[PDB]
Design a protein around this ligand. Structure first.
Ligand SMILES: CCC(C)(C)C(=O)O[C@H]1C[C@@H](C)C=C2C=C[C@H](C)[C@H](CC[C@@H](O)C[C@@H](O)CC(=O)O)[C@H]21
Length: 400
């Protein structure tokens, strides 16, 4: 019901198209479908194609997550090691506990060092100011940078922690920090490392961080169009895109551009656990709960909060979930849908992905929306993909 649902959304003028790529571990069941049209900077229309270059936005986080785990395999990092030396900017952050009534900020020194595992699972304390009201309040009083100067990761994310390292959960720049950590410990750019360790083994050559400079890629950017002459990804994140315009260097949190076909090669290598990217036991460890007791309780409070629908990535409020290395982790079966220990996340409001090892299925579904982005419609469209792909998978299994 992707077919009729997506077409209805095209007819209303709220999306231009969609790219969907799903596969089992061996490529027996494969479903690839490009729907709709893209618009070129010239205004001319072209059918959506499976090798259109998409803005991944926070789907970047999974890829940065793999890159960090590869440095762990190399012995350049450990999951639980002290990062204070490699990233002193993180060690220097204090923990904001709240405000007095005259609205002055209470902070405390950090009780422990920040580790890679905390960065990868959003339990370090680094929080997006637009999601954490306490951090939103601090940003505004200790304001303002209308500097507009292009900022590196460490010049962009200068706020205190939202909670003692390891003891909470809040979505934030942990993978931008992890990406910077990967650059520092390898002595090269994040693009260089990923090209060599992730894209080359999979035969991927059509990928770049913001800003996209390559002419061949720019000619295939969905997001280079009259509504987005900057190729900022506005349609994917729903207004802006502010962080991209203001950054300098690679942002492992949200910066990558990639085709759906190339993104699913990465998903499938994890699903099949074929050693192309990581040793099997390291992949297995991604699909485990890595929040401790306090952090798990914080996670569940955020999932029950008004932001919870975003944080639940379409999963039901009755489904117990944790956070793995790479995204949300289901902790029980939903019969007919995600098996237990499905890893899932997404990008902006328009893109979502899952890796269901128990049921042997992975996929990405990426709506190409029309500004202004109808957020409630995106949620529905993503949900249609997440469930219709299981329907298609069952029908195929039944036909064998
Ligand atoms: C730039 C953030 C990034 C990774 C692109 C992103 O897509 O995370 C997604 C993935 C999804 C699973 C869960 C999410 C959790 C909360 C949000 C609604 C977030 C989307 C935020 C984005 O819509 C607005 C930001 O761009 C704010 C800004 O413009 O600075 C959203």
């Amino acid at each position: 019901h992707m077919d009729t649902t997506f077409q209805a959304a095209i007819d209303t003028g709220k999306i231009n198209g969609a790219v969907v790529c799903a596969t089992d571990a061996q490529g027996h069941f494969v479903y690839n479908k490009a729907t709709g049209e893209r618009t070129l900077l010239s205004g001319e229309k072209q059918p959506q194609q499976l090798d259109d270059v998409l803005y991944l936005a926070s789907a970047t986080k999974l890829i940065t997550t793999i890159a960090a785990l590869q440095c762990v395999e190399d012995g350049l990092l450990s999951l639980d090691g002290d990062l204070s030396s490699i990233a002193p900017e993180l060690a220097a952050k204090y923990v904001l506990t709240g405000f007095t009534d005259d609205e002055s900020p209470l902070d405390d020194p950090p009780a422990r060092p920040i580790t890679l595992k905390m960065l990868l699972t959003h339990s370090s304390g680094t929080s997006y100011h637009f999601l954490d009201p306490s951090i939103a309040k601090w940003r505004a009083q200790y304001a303002n940078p209308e500097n507009e100067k292009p900022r590196l990761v460490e010049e962009m994310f200068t706020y205190p922690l939202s909670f003692q390292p390891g003891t909470g959960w809040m979505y934030g720049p942990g993978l931008d920090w992890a990406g910077r950590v990967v650059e520092r410990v390898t002595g090269g750019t994040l693009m260089e490392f990923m090209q060599k360790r992730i894209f080359d083994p999979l035969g991927i050559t059509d990928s770049q961080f913001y800003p996209v400079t390559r002419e061949d890629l720019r000619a295939r950017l969905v997001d280079l169009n009259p509504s987005d002459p900057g190729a900022l990804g506005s349609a994917v994140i729903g207004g802006g895109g502010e962080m991209n315009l203001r950054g300098r260097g690679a942002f492992g949190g949200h910066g990558l551009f990639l085709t759906g076909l190339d993104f699913v090669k990465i998903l499938r290598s994890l699903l099949a656990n074929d050693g192309m990217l990581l040793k099997p036991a390291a992949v297995d460890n991604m699909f485990q709960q890595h929040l401790g007791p306090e952090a798990a309780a914080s996670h569940r409070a955020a999932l029950a909060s008004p932001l919870g629908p975003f944080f639940r990535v379409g999963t039901d409020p009755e489904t117990k979930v944790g956070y793995g290395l790479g995204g949300l982790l289901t902790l029980e079966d939903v019969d007919g849908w995600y098996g237990e220990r499905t890893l899932t996340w997404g990008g902006g409001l328009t893109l979502t992905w899952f890796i269901d090892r128990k049921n042997n299925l992975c996929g990405v579904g990426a709506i190409q929306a029309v500004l202004p982005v109808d957020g409630d419609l995106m949620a529905d469209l993503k949900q249609t993909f997440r469930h219709d792909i299981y329907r298609k998978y069952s029908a195929w299994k039944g036909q064998q």
